[PDB]
Symmetry: D2
Subunit: 339 residues, 4 copies
């Protein structure tokens, strides 16, 4: 029904990674052959889906765990560069239907900043999408978080280019996987582990002052905010009425509600629940919520038939379906953008 | 306004642990001296609070991390026995105002089952409250989870005595603390880490078939369910439409919604939000929600002035405030129980 | 998906009233030929719909405006008796699928009480359903309301027989139609006028003390309560904080929330909105909400596909779908009643 | 806590109407002596309240029933002119704290249009506020509605001046009072009758095509929309799926949700319910909701302590508290307008 929707948690994989794609599909897809075809296709199947379901524009990004799974920094950087060059050539076929997020090796702040800049300046990419902490160390068992002063040069590049950063999940690996997840492995991914990682990282950015040093920085979370809106009251209470009397105020200058009004966005990817959407509208505001799908892990039909038919006032259907993202990503036009 | 409310996430500490109590208070209280007095008091300050705020009956339990912090199994068991003997003598002063949950060493399923039985049979305790995984191993860096076949003898003791088990959080320790939390330490506790632990453990019980082998087992989570109701739609979708086509059905026979209708309860402890309560009423049902406070980490005033004044239909105010817990814990009477 | 649902705002018309059926259809149906067949059919089409959509049991009632449109008390009484005899015979064909509400002339309290008693004692009808005020006076321009002492004998008959009374709407007529509705006639019926009538009558019963004189009396409103839940806060405030200080307490002894907890029920007839249902669960409580359809003015498909697929906790889906009505109407087994 | 709030359903009365003020107070106030002082005061008591509760700017309007109670068109017009001249002088004392709505006799479309124009062009009034239908006829028993072609000249004046029209309630009178309300008089006013009138009039404007002929017209309803949001689903269904197939489309060209997105506003006057506000954010959108008080029928304390302390995302608190009204009324700076 609604046309010109924008979706922006929409994944692709390189054709040369078919074995890795099938491993990931063995965890998260019930039809591996269709999954392989859909995650690698850019300009045919993906366009047919969007045409049937009123999706005018999609910002594509690399599948998880992606470059964050690569703990060799030279290999990781070369892979990020390869992916960005590849998707730039692919989306030129349909520029009124596709944009792309930069794919990044996050081993080094300046290296990541330079590649983000190359993507934005050379290819017009719309921002960055990163799958939660970079694997590093001898066997990839270390994690690189971005919520510290070493990453200021990177976050300042984001605000200078004025593009958002999408904190996507990745799977638990190594020591963390063995200790917490191996004995309850069906919880890996969307059921629980994904949100635990993203919420930890983003609230780390909050409590380590990233949005104080970079007040213009825009951060996006999928899956209606990875549990965080559920605890908006509880986090705010334990920040303002407890931890900010014990030292947190030294590195965290605004309330959690301020940061959601000024810096943080949430997306409807993989969470097609009108009851939860309404609750998020109360706790974060319809202005800060964007439609997305999580294709091809979710189907266009599930996401779009939900949203198109959800009971919702017309003002917020427009905002969530396209107008919020249209302003955030400075979209002058695209297919059906004002339909 | 409402009298005879029941609260059941209400903590005490032994007087001999003052140093440990002050360490915990240095993380989670803004007034250490009042905290020490309140967490150790049973029959004076705690009764004065309850009298002012319409709380007829409280089920007391041992402060976190409690016995789960003790990785010496002999020491841990002796401490659990000591705590249960102590609180039994304390609550006999005011039997129409206080019951108690068993405090347990969870190093060994049969040992824990026997001590739960002793508490219920000898002292009339109302169930068990355990602070998420037992520390074990050489330096307490291992975790004992209860979502496996070794714990069947324990869960069968719970269903035979027909008493619930409250899965309370504890702090992250050791390797997990260093890897995920040390660099964002203000998130430890109520802001995030507590819910991550409890939700992992309870959903582990779900996906490892604990409620299939023990369909009468009642499990309680505080803090409006430790994020889980937020993802009810998403978990249900990724169980029924994804993982249960890939192997999860082998150890998980009902839907997540079934388990919340039949086995799982949530509590309002430390989450005094009517907007979130309404959302939980939609996602889990008012029948499955219990009032609680989280005293003395939360104040009676915050919890009770919220609940007493919250906009709510009279049917559900009665149920959540006392009648749900009255039926669950088989309370024939207590102060103001039918006021 | 849910089987054994109960619906109880389901209308029929006498075959000999085809012209009245067609006039009403010309206001409220977009397929008059199907409507005529469906509103007169009891045991074939209506059963086929119920079998397809998991409706085990239906309490049937006479179409609006029905006997309340008849201002000749002799003609009105004879028609009520005719209708009750007719539907008693019809429902005997499928007694495990159908019950009936009494149809009443409400010109005289004792006469109406006697015919309700005959319906319950002779035919086992489940209650009464009445289309708002009884037209009266020489030209049918007066209105008989039931919220006064003259009707105590009638309400005492309801409580003695322990059966509920369903306050259904009727169209505005005569002077009221001319002054308020004739110049905006598209608002007649479900869009506005229906709820204005029923809410006036039920809140009249509240404020004139009917539920104080008859504390066991159960009153049912369709259409999620005819706007009243939206104003529960506002009515409660303007009663307890205003009118109850000015004289209302003389004839109204409990709060509006008390009466919804103790006396008033709402159904989902013609209001297939999960967002509004959730709000009603907050304002009135799931224990007080009953599934219903409003057939043949609404379709089985619209009502049942909505309810069966609505995002709802399993506890409340069971209560609203059938268990609330099973208890209220003291129902024996019926088709799929325990499925 | 929030400063610079805007309220715009704030009433005054002329000093020479003490008897009318006292009769109205005898229906709607529990402290008539304070009410008389507060409803006549402009520049002292009312300012003190606003200073204490963070209300920067108020648009003032004449008390109900006001000029709509006057069925002599000559007396009605003279009184409207008197009131507008009076309040223009009063608000000049504190022009950074007060604006005014036009008070109008609505006996004649051209006359009302001319007085609205005088108010805007001579005094800079912000719009019009009218208490539902104009009493008319020899004994005041007729009602003038504005949802017809005779009023096109008036609505065209609203859009030409680009100012909104606030449809405020009035009490039921004459035959309507006798037939519907006299025997249940405690429902008169906020409990029920007020909303019945306004919702009828506004939905009449919808279904008689006023917003089709005048697509720029902005209409404001108090009291969270006078029940209409509760039935948004039901009205929309009975328009688009029923009446629009039977002839309504001839005079009503968009959906009810379109008109709430494009033409209709609601305020929080006299409805200090976060639960209902959240529901209204789902059904109408936070962009279309305005803070207001309904002083002196409601207190500043009730309205502002509710709103300032309600659990709400920061984006919508800002919009509802002041930014929506700042844009709608094109307001220059006022006290704390950017605080
Ligand atoms: Mg994704
Ligand atoms: Mg606790
Ligand atoms: Mg009906
Ligand atoms: Mg007013």
């Amino acid at each position: 029904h609604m046309l010109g929707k924008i979706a922006l948690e929409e994944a692709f994989a390189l054709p040369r990674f078919e074995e890795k794609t099938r491993w990931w599909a063995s965890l998260f897809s019930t039809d591996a052959e269709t999954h392989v075809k859909e995650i690698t296709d850019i300009n045919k199947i993906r366009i047919e889906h969007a045409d049937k379901h009123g999706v005018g524009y999609q910002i594509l990004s690399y599948t998880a765990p992606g470059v964050q799974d690569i703990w060799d920094p030279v290999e990781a950087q070369a892979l990020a560069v390869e992916i960005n060059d590849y998707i730039a050539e692919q989306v030129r076929v349909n520029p009124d239907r596709f944009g792309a997020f930069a794919t990044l090796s996050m081993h080094n702040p300046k290296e990541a900043a330079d590649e983000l800049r190359r993507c934005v300046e050379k290819y017009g990419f719309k921002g960055a999408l990163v799958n939660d902490t970079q694997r590093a160390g001898p066997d990839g068992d270390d994690m690189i978080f971005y919520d510290n002063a070493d990453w200021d040069i990177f976050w300042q590049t984001c605000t200078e280019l004025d593009v958002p950063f999408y904190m996507h999940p990745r799977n638990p690996t190594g020591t963390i996987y063995e200790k917490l997840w191996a004995d309850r492995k069906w919880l890996v991914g969307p059921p629980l582990s994904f949100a635990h990682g993203v919420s930890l990282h983003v609230l780390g950015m909050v409590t380590n002052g990233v949005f104080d040093r970079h007040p213009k920085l825009q951060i996006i979370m999928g899956h209606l905010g990875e549990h965080v809106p559920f605890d908006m009251w509880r986090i705010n209470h334990w920040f303002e009425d407890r931890k900010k009397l014990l030292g947190l105020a030294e590195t965290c200058k605004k309330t959690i509600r301020d940061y959601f009004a000024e810096n943080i966005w949430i997306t409807t990817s993989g969470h097609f629940s009108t009851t939860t959407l309404n609750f998020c509208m109360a706790e974060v505001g319809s202005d800060r919520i964007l439609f997305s799908i999580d294709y091809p892990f979710e189907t266009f039909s599930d996401a779009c038939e939900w949203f198109d038919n959800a009971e919702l006032n017309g003002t917020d259907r427009l905002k969530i379906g396209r107008e919020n993202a249209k302003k955030l990503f400075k979209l002058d036009s695209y297919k059906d953008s004002s339909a």
